[PDB]
Design an enzyme around this catalytic site. Structure first.
Site, PDB file in Angstrom:
ATOM      1  CG  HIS A   1     -20.015  29.819  30.058  1.00 16.92           C
ATOM      2  ND1 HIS A   1     -20.756  28.770  30.558  1.00 16.92           N
ATOM      3  CD2 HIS A   1     -19.325  29.333  29.116  1.00 16.92           C
ATOM      4  CE1 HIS A   1     -20.571  27.808  29.635  1.00 16.92           C
ATOM      5  NE2 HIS A   1     -19.861  28.053  28.744  1.00 16.92           N
TER       6      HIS A   1
ATOM      7  CB  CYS B   1     -18.621  24.906  28.673  1.00 19.60           C
ATOM      8  SG  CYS B   1     -19.281  25.395  27.036  1.00 19.60           S
TER       9      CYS B   1
ATOM     10  CD  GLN C   1     -29.058  26.091  29.136  1.00 15.80           C
ATOM     11  OE1 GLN C   1     -29.516  24.660  29.530  1.00 15.80           O
ATOM     12  NE2 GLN C   1     -27.812  26.423  29.922  1.00 15.80           N
TER      13      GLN C   1
ATOM     14  CB  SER D   1     -25.440  23.423  31.398  1.00 10.78           C
ATOM     15  OG  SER D   1     -26.286  23.927  30.187  1.00 10.78           O
TER      16      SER D   1
ATOM     17  CG  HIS E   1     -23.446  28.821  33.491  1.00 10.12           C
ATOM     18  ND1 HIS E   1     -22.833  28.208  32.389  1.00 10.12           N
ATOM     19  CD2 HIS E   1     -24.556  27.983  33.581  1.00 10.12           C
ATOM     20  CE1 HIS E   1     -23.718  27.488  31.967  1.00 10.12           C
ATOM     21  NE2 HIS E   1     -24.742  27.253  32.771  1.00 10.12           N
TER      22      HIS E   1
HETATM   23  C1  LIG Z   1     -27.678  26.905  23.668  1.00  7.64           C
HETATM   24  N1  LIG Z   1     -26.723  27.293  24.807  1.00  7.64           N
HETATM   25  N2  LIG Z   1     -27.200  27.961  26.178  1.00  7.64           N
HETATM   26  C2  LIG Z   1     -26.273  28.181  26.933  1.00  7.64           C
HETATM   27  C3  LIG Z   1     -26.405  28.625  28.187  1.00  7.64           C
HETATM   28  O1  LIG Z   1     -25.963  27.868  29.264  1.00  7.64           O
HETATM   29  C4  LIG Z   1     -25.066  27.756  26.261  1.00  7.64           C
HETATM   30  C5  LIG Z   1     -23.608  27.566  26.656  1.00  7.64           C
HETATM   31  C6  LIG Z   1     -22.665  27.266  25.903  1.00  7.64           C
HETATM   32  C7  LIG Z   1     -23.097  26.540  24.572  1.00  7.64           C
HETATM   33  C8  LIG Z   1     -24.495  26.585  24.183  1.00  7.64           C
HETATM   34  C9  LIG Z   1     -25.288  27.219  24.781  1.00  7.64           C
HETATM   35  C1  LIG Z   2     -19.757  25.430  22.708  1.00  6.49           C
HETATM   36  N1  LIG Z   2     -18.790  26.195  22.390  1.00  6.49           N
HETATM   37  N2  LIG Z   2     -18.907  27.473  22.000  1.00  6.49           N
HETATM   38  C2  LIG Z   2     -17.850  28.173  21.408  1.00  6.49           C
HETATM   39  C3  LIG Z   2     -17.725  29.651  21.122  1.00  6.49           C
HETATM   40  O1  LIG Z   2     -16.415  30.077  21.410  1.00  6.49           O
HETATM   41  C4  LIG Z   2     -16.776  27.251  21.765  1.00  6.49           C
HETATM   42  C5  LIG Z   2     -15.481  27.313  21.200  1.00  6.49           C
HETATM   43  C6  LIG Z   2     -14.812  26.171  21.443  1.00  6.49           C
HETATM   44  C7  LIG Z   2     -15.362  24.955  21.699  1.00  6.49           C
HETATM   45  C8  LIG Z   2     -16.648  24.764  22.177  1.00  6.49           C
HETATM   46  C9  LIG Z   2     -17.319  26.266  21.970  1.00  6.49           C
END
Ligand SMILES: Cn1nc(CO)c2ccccc21
Ligand SMILES: Cn1nc(CO)c2ccccc21
Ligand SMILES: Cn1nc(CO)c2ccccc21
EC number: 5.2.1.8
Length: 147
Positions: free
Chosen positions: A43, A97, A115, A138, A141
């Site tokens: 995403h 993110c 989510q 958040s 997306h």
């Molecule tokens: C618990 N949760 N839910 C979402 C959906 O936005 C998400 C995206 C990245 C990392 C953790 C995440």
């Molecule tokens: C929240 N989230 N989730 C993933 C999974 O690829 C990830 C990888 C690198 C940094 C943050 C990250």
């Protein structure tokens, strides 16, 4: 008729029918083609001042409005669809993110982990398909289902 979430609509500007998915916010001219325990998605997140956490690795204090976030998201979708940019490239550069550092990849997940609007969009995407703007607490997306 159509896969889950899809409906027919009429282009205002052209008059031609198109297809819109009300779970993923995807839209396309072509009739949509053709659920698994898990999907794998990437995403691109654009946060805004009403995000659950208005902060990211890109910006300590995120101040843009939700409307401004949506316009950014719309512009990224346009560049991805035109081929001017790759999703992975835009996610790495502009996703709020921390998964930006993995070209937006979140890995594989089941129902009951993400989510809810994100999950629903992810599982309604076919492998290889991209969502439109998907709203969660958040931010907004763009979701790309990779597996
Ligand atoms: C618990 N949760 N839910 C979402 C959906 O936005 C998400 C995206 C990245 C990392 C953790 C995440
Ligand atoms: C929240 N989230 N989730 C993933 C999974 O690829 C990830 C990888 C690198 C940094 C943050 C990250
Ligand atoms: C590197 N990585 N990977 C995941 C999920 O696989 C994840 C979730 C939160 C923070 C960092 C994270």
């Amino acid at each position: 008729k159509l896969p889950p979430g899809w409906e027919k609509a009429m282009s205002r500007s052209s008059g031609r029918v198109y297809y819109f998915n009300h779970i993923t916010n995807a839209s396309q001219w072509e009739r949509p083609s053709g659920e698994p325990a898990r999907v794998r998605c990437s995403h691109l997140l654009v946060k805004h001042s009403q995000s659950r956490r208005p902060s990211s690795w890109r910006q300590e204090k995120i101040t843009r409005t939700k409307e401004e976030a949506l316009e950014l998201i719309n512009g990224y979708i346009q560049k991805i669809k035109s081929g001017e940019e790759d999703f992975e490239s835009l996610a790495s550069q502009f996703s709020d993110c921390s998964s930006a550092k993995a070209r937006g990849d979140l890995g594989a997940f089941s129902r009951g982990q993400m989510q809810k609007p994100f999950e629903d969009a992810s599982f309604a995407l076919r492998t290889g398909e991209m969502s439109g703007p998907v709203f969660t607490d958040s931010g907004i997306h763009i979701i790309l289902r990779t597996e």
